[model samples]
Target: KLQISNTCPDKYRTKQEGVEYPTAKKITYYSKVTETERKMNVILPVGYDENKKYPVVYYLHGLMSYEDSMLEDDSTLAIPTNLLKEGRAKEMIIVLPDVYAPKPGTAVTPDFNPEYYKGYDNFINELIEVIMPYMEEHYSILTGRENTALCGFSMGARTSLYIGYMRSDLIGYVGAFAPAPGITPGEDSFSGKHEGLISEDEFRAEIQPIVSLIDCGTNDSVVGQFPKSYHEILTRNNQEHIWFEVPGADHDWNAISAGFYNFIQTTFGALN
Candidate 1:
C-alpha cells in the first residue's frame, strides 16, 4: 500500500480511485524551495523485497500526458509485471515523475518554458537535486550511474536524451521513444543549448560508452521524423545507439507498446 501525498498536486489527474496495481506505488511531495508540488508513480518488481536494493529507471512522460499514463489500468501493469516475473528485464524499480510546471500563458510542462526552456536545466536540477534524493531516503535504490536508466516519450524523450547526453554521472542507460531533438538542423542551435550545461564535445565523448535505444513509428507523420533526425545527428557525432522504425504504425503508442517486451529484454538483458 502506497500513500499518495495529502498535498498531491491539485492540478493533474490521478490513478483510478479504487483500482490498484500490486507493484505500483504513488508518491507525492511538496517542495519548499521551488514552492511546488509533484508526484511520481513507482513500479516495483513483481516480488519486491525492500531488503535488497534494485536498479532504477526514471521514466518521463510526454508533453500532454499525465502522471499515470503507464499505470492507466490493471492491464497495463499486468504486462510489465508479467515480464518482470518471467525475467525478461532487469529486476528494477521504475519511477514515473511529474514534470508539469504550470504557469499563466503556456501549457504546463517541463518541456515548456517553466524551466527557462533552455533545454530543461531546471527540470534536470529538480530531479537530481530534489526528487532523486527524496526517493533514495525513502526507498531502496541502487546508488550508481550504471544501475540507473533514463527513459521518456516525445518531449520527455528529448529530455531523457539531453540529460543522458549531458549528465553521465546521473544517467547510464538511455531510452527515448519518438524523441523530439533538442538540436535541430543547424550550428547556432547546437552551440547555444549544448555548450553551457554539458559541452557538446563532452556529451559526444561520454555517450559512446553508454547503452542507448531509440524508436519511432514509421507511419507517424506528425513529429515522426524527430526520432530519425536525432539518430542522424548522433551518428554524425559518432554516437552509438540502437534505432528502430516501427512498421505499419502511427504517431501514437501502437508500435512501441507492441514491441516493448523485446526492447526490455534487449536493454536489460534477457534471463540467463
Candidate 2:
C-alpha cells in the first residue's frame, strides 16, 4: 500500500465541511526514450466519482521534489491541499509526476545525467499519450484542451511553459510561479535578456492565443527581473494574462504557495 501522510500545518485545517480530501495513488510506467520506468503519484479529489466529468490539472514539481512531496510536506510546502479543501478552487483531478533524475549527489544536485533530464520531454509525451488515455479510460473527465490546465514552480514552471506552449491544443490554461529564466536549451541565447528562447513576436504568435498566467515575488532576486519583460510581451500582443508580484516576498515556499492559490482561483475559477 502507498503510505500517505498529511503535510499541511495546523493553521491550515485539512478537514473542512464542503471541501473534499484528496486520495493518493502511485503508478509506475516505462519510458521508451529513457529506457526506465518512472513512478508518479496522482491525487484524486475528495468525493471523486467516475460518474461525474471533471477537469484535470497537472501540477509539476521543481527539481529534487518528488510527486509525493506535494502531499508529504509538513509545512504545507507543496501544492495547496488546503485550497482544495476550502472549495476556493474547482474540484479537479491533480496529477503530480516525479521529475527526479536518477543522478547521485546531494539534494541540490543528484547523480542523474543531463541526458536523463531531457527525459522531461519524453515524460510529457508519455503523459499525454499514455497517461491521459488511461485516465480517460477509467475516469469521467472532460477530454478537451479547454478543460485541461498545467502549472508549477521553478524548474516545474519552466517545464509548464515549454510543454504548454507546444501543446496548446491539449493544454489550454498554463501557470508558472517564480519561473527561472534559463532552463530550455538556448533559452538565454536570444538578444533580449530573460526574453525566453523565442522572440516577443514569436512568443505572442505561439502562446498568446492560449490562456497564460505568470506569477512571481517582487523580492525574489532570481526571478524578479522576469515579470516586467514578460508582462510587456503579453501587453504588446494584447494577450490576456495575469501578472502578480507580491511585495516583500523572496523565493520561499510560503510566497510560492500564496501565489499559486491566487493563480488557480483567478485563472481556473474564471473559466468555471
Candidate 3:
C-alpha cells in the first residue's frame, strides 16, 4: 500500500520500470540506546501472505543517507526496483536502516555512546533486540541465523562488515560494497584502532564460518585498497569471502547499487 512519490531529488533517485518487487512500507522501531527513536523502511515482496515465512536482508545505508532514500530516487542509483520487478532477485524483505552518526561535539551525540563511529553497535543491537522482534511479531518471517542476511554501501558497507563480524550467529550472509578499510576496536572518525570488539584468536575462529562478499570499485579514490586489505585479513584468518572490482565504476551509489542488486540475488536463499 506504499505510494511512489515523484518529489525525490535527482541525486538520490532511481528508475523503476521492469523490476517488480513488492510494495514498500516506511516503518519505525524505537530504541532505548539512543533514548530517543530510530527508524527503518521495509520493502515487502508482492503477494506477501501472513501465513508464509520469508527470509530477510537487513540493508544498512551509508553516511548522509537514510532508509527513505532507497525507494524515492530515480537515477537508477538505489536498489534497482526494476530488477526486483523482473525477478532477477528473489522475492524477500529488504530492510533499509539509517546509519547516520552525529558529528563529535554535537549536542545530539550521546554520552555513553556504543556507536561512537555512528553508533553502529547500538543501532545493530536495537535491530536485534527491538526491530527483529517487532518484525516477527507482525510478519511471517523465518527465524534463524541462516535465514538472515546483511549488506550495505560505503559507510553502510563498513557497518555491514562490522555488524556481520560481531553478529555472525544471527546473520548468515554479509556483503560490503565499496567498504572502508580500517575498523578496529576503538576507531576515531571511522579510522583508527579497535580495542576489544573481537580478539585476534576469536576473530580467526569465527570468521571461517561466516559467508561474506567483499567488493570495491577500481576507481574508488577513498578506499581503493579496501578489497586487498580486507582480503588479506580474511586470508590470514582462513575465512571465506568473495572479492570483486567493478571495472568502470567509482565510489558512488551507482556502482554500489548495481553491485548490491547482484550480490543479494546470489546470497539470498542460500544456506551458510
**Cα lDDT of model 3 overall?**
0.62
lDDT of 2 by residue, 48-163 (tens): 78888888777777655678866654322223456554555576777777754332231134322343345443456666766677678766888787678888776677677767
**Which ranges of candidate 2 are over 4 A from the true structure?**
1-20, 72-87, 100-117, 121-123, 183-197, 205-210, 221-224, 267-272
lDDT (10s digit) by residue, model 1, range 209-228: 35776787787664557688
- Candidate 2, clashing residue pairs? 103-110, 103-111, 103-112, 104-111
lDDT of each: 0.61, 0.60, 0.62
Each candidate structure's TM-score, on Cα atoms with residue i matched to residue i, is: 0.75, 0.74, 0.76
Roughly what TM-score does model 1 have, to 2 decimal places?
Answer: 0.75
What alpha-carbon RMSD in Å does predicted model 2 have with respect to the real structure? 7.3
Candidate 1: pairs in clash: none
Candidate 3 lDDT tens digits, 124-173: 76677777887788888988877788888766777777778777878888
Off by over 4 Å in 1: 1-21, 73-76, 102-121, 185-209, 267-272
How displaced is residue 119 in candidate 3, in Å? Answer: 1.5
Best by TM-score: 3
- What is the C-alpha local distance difference test score of candidate 2? 0.60
Where is model 1 poorest over a 10-residue stretch in terms of lDDT?
Answer: 3-12
